[PDB]
Design a protein around this ligand. Structure first.
Ligand SMILES: CC(C)CN(C[C@@H](O)[C@H](Cc1ccccc1)NC(=O)O[C@H]1CO[C@H]2OCC[C@H]21)S(=O)(=O)c1ccc(C(=O)O)cc1
Lengths: 99, 99
C-alpha cells in the first residue's frame, strides 16, 4: 500500500498469536510494543525517547505479521504509550518514504 | 526522493535562518526541534513521548525548508533529544509511506 500522513499510519499486526494495532514509525530505530505476553527469554534494556528513558524487555527473532507481510527480528516490550513498528522491521516489509 | 529505511531518514532543513538536520518521523504528530532561537511569540505546551512528557514552546506559522521543500506550520521547541519533522509538516511536502 501507499499511505498518506494526514492521519497516524496505524496498521493491524499479529504477534504472539495476538492482534494489535501499531504505528509505522520512521523515527524509531527499534520496534516497541506495550506490555503484552510474549513467549521466551529476554534481556533487560533501556531505550531513550522524547521525555527520557524506559526499561524494556528485548526479544530477538520474534515473528510479526504487519499488514500481511511477515517479519522476524527484535521486539522491545515495556511501558511505551503506543505500539511502534520501527526501522528494524520496516526494512523487512519493504517500507519506504517518498516525496 | 525515495528514502529507504536501512538508516535514519535524516534530512537537512532551514528554519529561522539556520541549518539543522532533522528526522523524517511518521510516528510523530507534530514537529519538535531542540533548543534554538526562533523569532516570534510562543505558547507553553506539553507533549508526551516514549519516556514521558516534556515542556515545549509552541510556535505557529513557522517557515521550514525541508530538503529544499517549503512548509509552514507549528513547530515545538524544547528538550527533545533529536530534531523531528512530524506529520503536520510531512503532509505539506507530499511525503508518503510505501510498501
Ligand atoms: C514515540 C512516540 C510517542 C512518538 N515519538 C515519535 C518517534 O518517532 C520518536 C522520535 C524520537 C524521539 C526521541 C529520540 C529520537 C527520535 N522515536 C522514538 O521515540 O523511538 C524510540 C524507539 O526507537 C528508538 O530510536 C529512536 C529513539 C528510540 S515522540 O516522542 O518523539 C513525539 C511525541 C509527541 C509528539 C507530538 O507531536 O505530540 C511528537 C513526537
Amino acid at each position: 500500500p501507499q499511505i498518506t500522513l494526514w492521519q497516524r499510519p496505524l496498521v493491524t499486526i499479529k504477534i504472539g498469536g495476538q492482534l494489535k494495532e501499531a504505528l509505522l514509525d520512521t523515527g524509531a530505530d527499534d520496534t516497541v510494543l506495550e506490555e503484552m505476553s510474549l513467549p521466551g527469554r529476554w534481556k533487560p534494556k533501556m531505550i531513550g525517547g522524547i521525555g527520557g528513558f524506559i526499561k524494556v524487555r528485548q526479544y530477538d527473532q520474534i515473528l510479526i505479521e504487519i499488514c500481511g507481510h511477515k517479519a522476524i527480528g527484535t521486539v522491545l516490550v515495556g511501558p511505551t504509550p503506543v505500539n511502534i513498528i520501527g526501522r528494524n522491521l520496516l526494512t523487512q516489509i519493504g517500507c519506504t518514504l517518498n516525496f
